[PDB]
Structures are given as structure tokens and as C-alpha cells.
């Protein structure tokens, strides 16, 4: 069921037209013009069957966190060189062979990172590793304030601009969450129209647990990507099949992060900014606001450690 005739015009809800290009169910797009949908377009179009959760979901959290100028304006007042939250351009409903089908415009990125790293046999270095985690720290402060949480962060949810290898981007937000509606908190408690748990090796502790996702989960699932993208290896990786055994250590390894750092480092010789981050982490409560400019200043203090300094270099 080809959803669109290659090379179709598609006018969106507030008449803005869209050129459908081949695909990459999401398609290449671009502005309405005489030439045709290319290769280096820099937009994309999902479509799904209008009732599809997800796409609902994901299309909500754009409508209310992503339009282009909210995010530009973030950027300038906190001083960003970049904001890694895709852009929303638009949406709407499209019906074919007598079904309905809902569609969204956002921005088209270049690889993620999980082939990335991949390639080069399971490794980033611990400049790649601060460098990609301070700029995922803006992204979360960012949809934590727009009352979202991601409850996902993974290599392969992170995409590079396709112009701009050193700026990374967070997506898929179909099964993100609104964690704090109209600014009132959800309870420490399961929601019953929630059936995701985040990916089994980096989900949080909360997750396991059966409660919705909160912040701290956020910080903790991107605590377990810094060692897995570091070393190769998280301790727990050779049981994922039991989700009891996975969180048994997380719980554990949370109790006395020093052995965390034991386990997953060698000898005497774990990077202290990664132990400070996760102990900070540990120290929020369920609905507490983290301290987000005091996580990314003990990533910087990692980076003045190696050498370096925040310079937005990747080095990928």
C-alpha cells in the first residue's frame, strides 16, 4: 500500500504544500517547487493509519515542543549553538484506497549513531562520549521543560544534522510521555494507558519498577549509555531475556556505585566525572527538578581532565 504517489504535491493544515519524495513508512519531502523531491532533501514525511497510537503520540509532543520558532528562541536566550530537538513543519490527514492516513513534516538527519559506533568496534572515546552527552543534557532539559520525558535514549535514537556531523539530535517520540501536564507532576505510580518500559540494558530503575518515567529516568538511561558507549559492555548485558536479572543489578550497582565503576572499568582507572554524574543522578527524588547545569559542569570537569574543553567537536 504505497501511501503517496511519488513526486504528489501534499498541502498540510495551515495550507503550507510539501513535495512527497522516495522513501528512506517515512518519505523524503521538501517545499512545493517545479523540481523534484532529491536525495539531500532536508525534510521528511511520516505517515500512518490515522489510528496509530504512536504517531499521535510523537505528533502531539512536535505540535507542543517543536515549532521552529519556539526552539530558535530557546537557543538564543540560553546561549546554544544548536538545540538537538528535530523541528515540526507541519501535518495532517491524507486518505487513500478508502483509508485514512495521518502524515507529519520534520527534519531529515544523517546517520545514527548506533552505526556509528558500530563501526567503530563498539567504542567512543571520552571526548566523543562528554561531547555528545552535554548536548544530549541541553536536549533533555529542553522536553523536561516542555513537560515531556523521552524515557529512550539510545545510539540509535540519536541521528547527526546530515549537514553537520558534530551537532546529534533526539528522536522518536511515539512513545514519549507527559510527565507533568498543565505542571502538575504524576504520582509515583504505573499509568494504565503506558505499556512501554524503554529498551531493557539502559531503561531505568523506575521503569523496571513499573512506574511512568520521570526525569531522573532520563539521567539514569543516559548514565547507562556513557558506559556502554565507553567500554563495549554494560554488567548485566549477557541476561536481557530477564528483566528481574536487569534490574537486580541496576538496584544493586545504584546501592554502591564504586563497584559499578570497578566492574565496568579496569584496574583503578574509571573516568570520576561518570561516578559524580551517577551519584548525582541517584540523589533526585521521583518528581524532583534536576540540576541540569550542575550535570553538565561535571561533564566539563571531565573534559578539562582529558585536555579538552566544550568546543562542540563530536570527533566522530
Not at 501535518?91 to 563501526?119: C, P, T, V
Not at 571526548?127 to 513537560?147: C, F, P
Amino acid at each position: 500500500a504505497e501511501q503517496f504517489a511519488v513526486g504528489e504535491i501534499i498541502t498540510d493544515m495551515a495550507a503550507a504544500a510539501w513535495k512527497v519524495g522516495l522513501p528512506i513508512c517515512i518519505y523524503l519531502a521538501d517545499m512545493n517547487s517545479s523540481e523534484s523531491v532529491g536525495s539531500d532533501a532536508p525534510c521528511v514525511v511520516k505517515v500512518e493509519p490515522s489510528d496509530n497510537g504512536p504517531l499521535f503520540t510523537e505528533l502531539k509532543f512536535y505540535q507542543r515542543a517543536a515549532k521552529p520558532e519556539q526552539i530558535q528562541k530557546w537557543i538564543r536566550t540560553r546561549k546554544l549553538k544548536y538545540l538537538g530537538v528535530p523541528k515540526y513543519w507541519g501535518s495532517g490527514l491524507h486518505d487513500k484506497n478508502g483509508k485514512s492516513y495521518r502524515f507529519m513534516i520534520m527534519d531529515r538527519f544523517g546517520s545514527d549513531l548506533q552505526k556509528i559506533y558500530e563501526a567503530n568496534a563498539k567504542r567512543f572515546s571520552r571526548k566523543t562520549v562528554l561531547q555528545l552527552s552535554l548536548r544530549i543534557l541541553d536536549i533533555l532539559e529542553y522536553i523536561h521543560e516542555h513537560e515531556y520525558v523521552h524515557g529512550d535514549i539510545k545510539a540509535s535514537n540519536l541521528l547527526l544534522n546530515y549537514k553537520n556531523p558534530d551537532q546529534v539530535y533526539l528522536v522518536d517520540y511515539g512513545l514519549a510521555y507527559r510527565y507533568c501536564p498543565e505542571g502538575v507532576h504524576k504520582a509515583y505510580a504505573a499509568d494504565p494507558k503506558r505499556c512501554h518500559d524503554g529498551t531493557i540494558e539502559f531503561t531505568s530503575i523506575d521503569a523496571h519498577n513499573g512506574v511512568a518515567p520521570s526525569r531522573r529516568g532520563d539521567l539514569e538511561i543516559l548514565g547507562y549509555c556513557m558506559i556502554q558507549w565507553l567500554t563495549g559492555h554494560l554488567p548485566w548485558e549477557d541476561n536481557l531475556k530477564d528483566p528481574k536479572y536487569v534490574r537486580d543489578s541496576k538496584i544493586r550497582y545504584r546501592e554502591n556505585i564504586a563497584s559499578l565503576m570497578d566492574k565496568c572499568f579496569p584496574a583503578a582507572n574509571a573516568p570520576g566525572e561518570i561516578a559524580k554524574y551517577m551519584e548525582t543522578v541517584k540523589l533526585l527524588d521521583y518528581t524532583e527538578k534536576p540540576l541540569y547545569e550542575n550535570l553538565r559542569d561535571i561533564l566539563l570537569q571531565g573534559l578539562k581532565a582529558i585536555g579538552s574543553k566544550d568546543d562542540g567537536k563530536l570527533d566522530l
